[PDB]
A paper describes a structure:
Wzi, an integral outer-membrane protein from Escherichia coli, has been implicated in the formation of group 1 capsules. We conclude that Wzi is a novel outer-membrane lectin that assists in the formation of the bacterial capsule via direct interaction with capsular polysaccharides. We propose that Wzi exposed on the surface of the cell acts as a lectin to bind to nascent EPS as it leaves the cell through the Wza translocase.
The 2.6 Å resolution structure of Wzi reveals an 18-stranded β-barrel fold with a novel arrangement of long extracellular loops that blocks the extracellular entrance and a helical bundle that plugs the periplasmic end. The X-ray structure reveals Wzi to be an 18-stranded antiparallel β-barrel, with the wall of the barrel describing a circle approximately 36 Å in diameter. Visual inspection and analysis with PISA indicates that Wzi is a monomer. The first-ordered residue is A24 (residues 1–23 are the cleaved signal peptide) and the last-ordered residue is L477 (C terminus of the mature protein). Not seen are residues 275–287, which form part of an extended loop between β9 and β10 (loop L5) and the C-terminal His tag. The long extracellular loops—L3, L5, and L7—adopt distinct structures, parts of which fold into the barrel, whereas loops L5, L6, and L7 extend beyond the circumference of the barrel wall. The other loops are folded into the barrel and completely occlude the pore (PoreWalker [Pellegrini-Calace et al., 2009]). The lengths of the β strands are irregular; β4 is only six residues long and results in a triangular “notch” at the extracellular face of the barrel. Loops L3, L6, and L7 pack together to form a complex, positively charged electrostatic surface consistent with binding of the negatively charged sugar.
Author numbering: 24 to 274, 288 to 477
The structure:
C-alpha cells in the first residue's frame, strides 16, 4: 500500500497496458498511489494472452518493490556519457541499499539506507537515507515525509520541471489515493484528476543555504484519449531570504508549464500515443514564457505472448529554442535550478537539445532486452552550475540493456554503452550492473 516511487519496469508495464486500453491510469505524476493502481486493475479488460502476462506482472512487481526487507546493489565501470531516463540516474558508481518496508490501509513506511562508492553526485557522507519516507492516509489523501523522488510529466527521458536526475530532497508531499472523477454533476466532465503538492529543502545548496522548493501539479483526463497537466514550482526561502507566510504568495524563482498525452487506441485502435511538455522560466499570468520544450511519440505492441515498448522523444532546454544562458539559471538562486550540481529538471541541464529512441522486448519469462540511441548537444555555454554535463559537448551514444531473474526472486539489471563525445569526463565505453533481492520477515 501507499506511495510507489519511480520504478522503470513498473512504469513501462503500466504504460503498455494503458496505451492499449486494457487499463486507464495516469502515469505522468509520480510517485503513484498504489490504491489507484489497484482500482484500474479491477476494471481491466484484457483480450490477448500477451495482455494477461503483463497484467499478472503488475502485482508481482509491487510485491517485489514493497517486500518486507529489500537489498539493492549497483556497480559500474563509470558514469554513462549520455543522460539517463525515468528511474535510471544513479548517484554513484557503486551503491548498496537496505530497506525495511511496511504498509497498510492507512500507512506506508519505507526505511531506506544507502552506502556509496565513487560519488558522481556530491554529498555530506557516503551514507544516506534517499528514498526513505513514512506516509499516512486520511480522507483519501496521502501525507508523506522523507526524501521521496518525483516525476512530473509524460516524458520517458526527462521532466522539464521536476525529474529524477539528482538526489531526492527532504520534505512533505501530498496526493489523492484514489483518483476517481468528481461526483458533483457539473464537474463530472473533468474526469480522473490528481494533485500533488510538495514542500522541500535543498541540500548543500551553497549560494543560498536551506533553500526551499515548493510546488504544485494538477492533471485531468476529460476523455479517455487526452490527459492534460499543469505544474508550478517556486524556489523560495533560504539564508538572507524572505521566509514569511506573506512573502510566500503567488501573485523567489518560478518554473511553470503544461503537459499532455494523447492516446490513439480509443479511436484508431493503434496502441500508440504522443505527448508533449512546455515549461517556462517566466509567467505571463496564465501562460508561461522563456519556454523549454519536450515532445515524443510512443507505441506498445504484443508479439507472441511477449511485449514490445518503444518511444521517440525530443527535448529542447534552451530558451525558445535559440537563446542560451537563461534556462535553469537564476540571479538570486545563483547555483541555478540544480541540487549538488545535478538538475532538478531534465537530466541534461539547461541549453540542451536531445533526440532519443528506445525499443524493448519483454518476454513472458520477464526477461527484458533494450536498445537506446541518443543524440545530445549539452551545456553549450560551459556553465559551472551543471556538474552533470560540465562541458559543451555533442553526444552520440548507443545503450543496450538486459533485465532478468537469476535465482528465484533475485533480479539482475545490466547495461552496456558507447558514447562518441568531444570532451566528456567519462569513458567512451562502459557497463553497469544492478541487483534486487526481496525478503520476507
Ligand atoms: C563500501 C563501498 C560501497 C559498496 C559497493 C558494493 C557494490 C556491489 C554491487 C553488486 C551488484 C552486482
Ligand atoms: C570494480 C568496479 C567495476 C564494476 C564493473 C561491473 C560491470 C559489469 C557489467 C557487464 C555487462 C556486460
Ligand atoms: C502499524 C502502524 C504503523 C504506522 C506508522 C506510520 C508513521 C509515519 C507517518 C509519517 C507521515 C508524515
Ligand atoms: C517472439 C519474438 C522474439 C524475438 C526477439 C529477438 C530480438 C531481441 C534483440 C535484443 C538485442 C538487445
Ligand atoms: C534472446 C534474444 C537474442 C539475444 C541477443 C544477444 C545480444 C547481447 C546484448 C547484451 C546487452 C547487455
Ligand atoms: C532460470 C534462471 C537463470 C538465469 C540466469 C541468467 C544469468 C545471466 C548473468 C549474465 C551476467 C553478465
Ligand atoms: C578506460 C576504458 C576501459 C573501459 C573498460 C570497461 C568496459 C567493460 C565492458 C565490457 C565487459 C566485457
Ligand atoms: C511492525 C510495524 C512497524 C512500523 C514502524 C513505524 C515507524 C514509525
Ligand atoms: C480519518 C480522520 C483522520 C484525520 C487526520 C487529520 C490529519 C491532519
Ligand atoms: C484510521 C485513520 C488513521 C488516521 C491517521 C492520521 C495521522 C496523522
Ligand atoms: C521514516 C522517516 C525518514 C526520514 C529520512 C530523512 C532524513 C534526511
Ligand atoms: C466531487 C467534487 C470534487 C471537487 C474538486 C473538483 C476538481 C476540479
Ligand atoms: C573493468 C571490469 C569489467 C568487468 C566485466 C565483467
Ligand atoms: C478534498 C480535496 C483536497 C485537495 C487538497 C489540496
Ligand atoms: C493545486 C495544484 C496547482 C497547479 C497549478 C498549475
Ligand atoms: C525477427 C526480429 C529481428 C529483430 C532484430 C533486432
Ligand atoms: C552511436 C554510434 C555511432 C557513432 C558514430 C558517429
Amino acid at each position: 500500500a501507499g506511495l510507489v516511487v519511480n520504478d522503470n519496469d513498473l512504469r513501462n508495464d503500466l504504460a503498455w497496458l494503458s496505451d492499449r486500453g486494457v487499463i486507464h491510469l495516469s502515469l505522468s505524476t509520480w510517485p503513484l498511489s498504489q490504491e489507484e493502481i489497484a482500482r484500474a486493475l479491477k476494471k481491466a479488460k484484457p483480450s490477448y494472452s500477451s495482455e494477461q502476462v503483463v497484467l499478472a506482472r503488475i502485482n508481482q512487481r509491487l510485491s517485489a518493490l514493497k517486500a518486507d526487507f529489500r537489498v539493492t546493489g549497483y556497480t559500474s565501470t563509470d558514469q554513462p556519457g549520455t543522460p539517463q531516463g525515468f528511474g535510471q540516474t544513479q548517484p554513484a558508481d557503486n551503491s548498496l541499499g537496505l530497506a525495511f518496508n511496511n504498509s497498510g490501509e492507512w500507512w506506508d513506511v519505507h526505511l531506506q539506507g544507502n552506502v556509496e562508492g565513487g560519488e558522481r553526485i556530491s554529498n555530506g557522507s557516503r551514507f544516506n537515507a534517499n528514498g526513505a519516507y513514512g506516509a499516512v492516509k486520511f480522507w483519501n489523501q496521502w501525507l508523506s515525509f522523507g526524501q521521496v523522488p518525483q516525476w512530473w510529466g509524460p516524458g520517458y527521458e526527462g521532466s522539464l520541471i521536476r525529474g529524477d536526475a539528482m538526489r531526492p530532497m527532504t520534505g512533505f508531499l501530498m496526493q489523492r489515493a484514489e483518483q476517481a472523477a468528481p461526483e458533483t454533476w457539473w464537474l463530472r466532465w473533468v474526469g480522473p484528476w490528481q494533485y500533488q503538492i510538495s514542500a522541500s529543502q535543498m541540500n548543500q545548496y551553497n549560494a543560498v543555504p536551506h533553500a526551499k522548493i515548493i510546488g504544485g501539479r494538477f492533471t485531468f483526463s476529460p476523455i479517455q484519449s487526452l490527459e492534460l497537466g499543469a505544474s508550478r514550482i517556486m524556489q523560495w526561502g533560504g539564508k538572507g531570504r524572505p521566509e514569511s507566510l506573506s512573502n510566500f504568495w503567488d501573485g523567489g524563482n518560478q518554473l511553470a508549464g503544461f503537459d499532455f498525452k494523447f492516446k490513439l487506441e480509443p479511436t484508431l485502435g493503434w496502441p500508440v500515443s504522443f505527448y508533449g511538455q512546455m515549461i517556462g522560466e517566466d509567467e505571463s499570468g496564465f501562460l508561461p514564457s522563456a519556454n523549454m520544450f519536450l515532445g515524443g511519440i510512443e507505441g506498445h505492441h504484443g508479439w507472441g505472448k511477449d511485449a514490445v515498448n518503444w518511444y521517440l522523444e525530443a527535448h529542447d532546454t534552451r530558451t525558445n529554442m535559440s537563446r542560451t544562458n537563461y534556462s535553469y539559471t537564476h540571479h538570486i538562486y545563483k547555483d541555478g535550478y540544480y541540487q549538488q550540481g545535478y538538475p532538478l529538471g531534465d537530466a541534461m541541464g539547461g541549453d540542451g537539445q536531445l533526440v532519443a529512441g528506445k525499443v524493448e522486448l519483454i518476454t513472458e519469462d520477464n526477461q527484458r532486452w533494450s536498445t537506446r540511441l541518443v543524440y545530445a548537444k549539452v551545456n553549450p555555454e560551459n556553465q559551472s552550475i551543471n556538474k552533470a554535463f560540465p562541458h559543451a559537448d555533442t553526444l552520440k551514444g548507443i545503450q543496450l540493456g538486459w533485465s532478468g531473474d537469476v535465482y528465484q526472486s533475485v533480479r539482475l539489471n545490466t547495461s552496456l554503452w558507447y558514447t562518441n563525445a568531444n570532451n566528456s569526463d567519462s569513458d567512451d565505453v562502459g557497463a553497469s550492473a544492478g541487483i534486487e533481492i526481496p525478503f520476507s520477515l
